[PDB]
């Protein structure tokens, strides 16, 4: 009357192919965060996600149908990459790589890829910091996680630096800046220009508190 | 030229920030989970 075991299988602590409804919720959340920039990713990764997305929405790649011009790119990429050369061609190569995988397999692999990035689950703020060796402010991504703070390249999304929350001695904000003091771990403060210093401070406090209450129980 | 005025502007913008950031208020006297390098 039917065989469950003919299907793709994968289960880890984050996601599970055997729970379709829960999986779709996980997929929707992860995809939205990437498409709208809440989860910043590199160009290369965006196209990989896009390729899984295409498999999910269109099924297996059909080369004479799914070609440059077919996609509404803004539906498949973070805005940053919509106008970048060869975007669509990259997406379709990743789409082709999916072969005949099912919708569920594609969703599992999308969620897995998202969770595999260091940027997963990080709240990022676009700020300006001093440029190395220059009296000049340039853009950068400042991320707050459950247990750390990280500097990330706004273009490539490379993680440039990461400080554990346990190395942060104190922090301060003004309506135009935000500053971290790492006490004995390094000589100089880290300050950036931003109008969102208050939000940043609250996330940091909030996350420290969650950790301080783990120790208790 | 375009580059000259930009440079002047950028340096002023940097100088403004260096001054303003000293106005920041510390949101705590110390982080509860901070560990000295010798303790972590």
Swiss-Prot record, chain A:
Residues 7-215 form the FERM domain. It is found in: Cytoplasm; Cell junction, Focal adhesion; Synapse; Cell membrane. Residues 121-215 are annotated as: Interaction with PIP5K1C. Transmembrane segments: none annotated. It comes from the Eukaryota. Interacts directly with PIP5K1C. As a major component of focal adhesion plaques that links integrin to the actin cytoskeleton, may play an important role in cell adhesion. Recruits PIP5K1C to focal adhesion plaques and strongly activates its kinase activity. This is Talin-2. It comes from Mus musculus.
Curated annotation (Swiss-Prot), chain B:
Residues 3-35 are cytoplasmic. The modification Phosphotyrosine is found at residue 34. Induction: Induced in alveolar epithelial cells during exposure to the fungus R.delemar, a causative agent of mucormycosis. Expressed in vascular smooth muscle cells (at protein level). It comes from the Eukaryota. It is found in: Cell membrane; Cell projection, Invadopodium membrane; Cell projection, Ruffle membrane; Recycling endosome. Antibodies against integrin beta-1 ITGB1 protects epithelial cells from invasion by the fungus R.delemar, a causative agent of mucormycosis, and could thus potentially be used to treat mucormycosis disease. Antibodies against the protein also protect a neutropenic mouse model against mucormycosis. Heterodimer of an alpha and a beta subunit. Beta-1 associates with either alpha-1, alpha-2, alpha-3, alpha-4, alpha-5, alpha-6, alpha-7, alpha-8, alpha-9, alpha-10, alpha-11 or alpha-V. ITGA6:ITGB1 is found in a complex with CD9; interaction takes place in oocytes and is involved in sperm-egg fusion. Interacts with seprase FAP (seprase); the interaction occurs at the cell surface of invadopodia membrane in a collagen-dependent manner. Binds LGALS3BP and NMRK2, when associated with alpha-7, but not with alpha-5. Interacts with FGR and HCK. (Microbial infection) Integrin ITGA2:ITGB1 interacts with human echoviruses 1 and 8 capsid proteins. Integrins alpha-1/beta-1, alpha-2/beta-1, alpha-10/beta-1 and alpha-11/beta-1 are receptors for collagen. Integrins alpha-1/beta-1 and alpha-2/beta-2 recognize the proline-hydroxylated sequence G-F-P-G-E-R in collagen. Integrins alpha-2/beta-1, alpha-3/beta-1, alpha-4/beta-1, alpha-5/beta-1, alpha-8/beta-1, alpha-10/beta-1, alpha-11/beta-1 and alpha-V/beta-1 are receptors for fibronectin. Alpha-4/beta-1 recognizes one or more domains within the alternatively spliced CS-1 and CS-5 regions of fibronectin. Integrin alpha-5/beta-1 is a receptor for fibrinogen. (Microbial infection) Integrin ITGA2:ITGB1 acts as a receptor for Human echoviruses 1 and 8. This is Integrin beta-1. It comes from Homo sapiens. The gene is ITGB1. The chain holds residues 752 to 784 of 798 of the full protein.
């Amino acid at each position: 009357g039917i065989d469950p075991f003919t299907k793709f299988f994968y289960s880890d602590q984050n996601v599970d192919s055997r729970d379709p409804v829960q999986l779709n919720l996980l997929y929707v959340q992860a995809r939205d965060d990437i498409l709208n920039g809440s989860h910043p990713v590199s160009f290369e990764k965006a196209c990989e996600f896009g390729g899984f997305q295409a498999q999910i929405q269109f099924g297996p790649h059909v080369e004479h149908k799914h070609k440059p011009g077919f996609l509404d790119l803004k539906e498949f990429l973070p805005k940053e990459y919509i106008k970048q050369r060869g975007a669509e061609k990259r997406i379709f190569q990743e789409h082709k790589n999916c072969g005949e995988m099912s919708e569920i397999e594609a969703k599992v692999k999308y969620v897995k890829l998202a969770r595999s990035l260091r940027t997963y689950g990080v709240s990022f703020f676009l700020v300006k910091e001093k440029m190395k060796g220059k009296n000049k402010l340039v853009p950068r991504l400042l991320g707050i996680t459950k247990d750390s703070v990280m500097r990330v390249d706004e273009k490539t999304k490379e993680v440039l630096q990461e400080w554990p929350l346990t190395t942060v001695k104190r922090w301060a904000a003004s309506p135009k800046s935000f500053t971290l003091d790492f006490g004995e771990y390094q000589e100089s403060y880290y300050s950036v220009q931003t109008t969102e210093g208050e939000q940043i401070s609250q996330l940091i406090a909030g996350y420290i508190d969650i950790i301080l209450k783990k120790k208790q129980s | 030229g375009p580059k000259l005025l930009m440079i002047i502007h950028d340096r002023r913008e940097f100088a403004k920030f260096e001054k303003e950031k000293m106005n920041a208020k510390w949101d705590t006297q110390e982080n509860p989970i901070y560990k000295s390098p010798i303790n972590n």
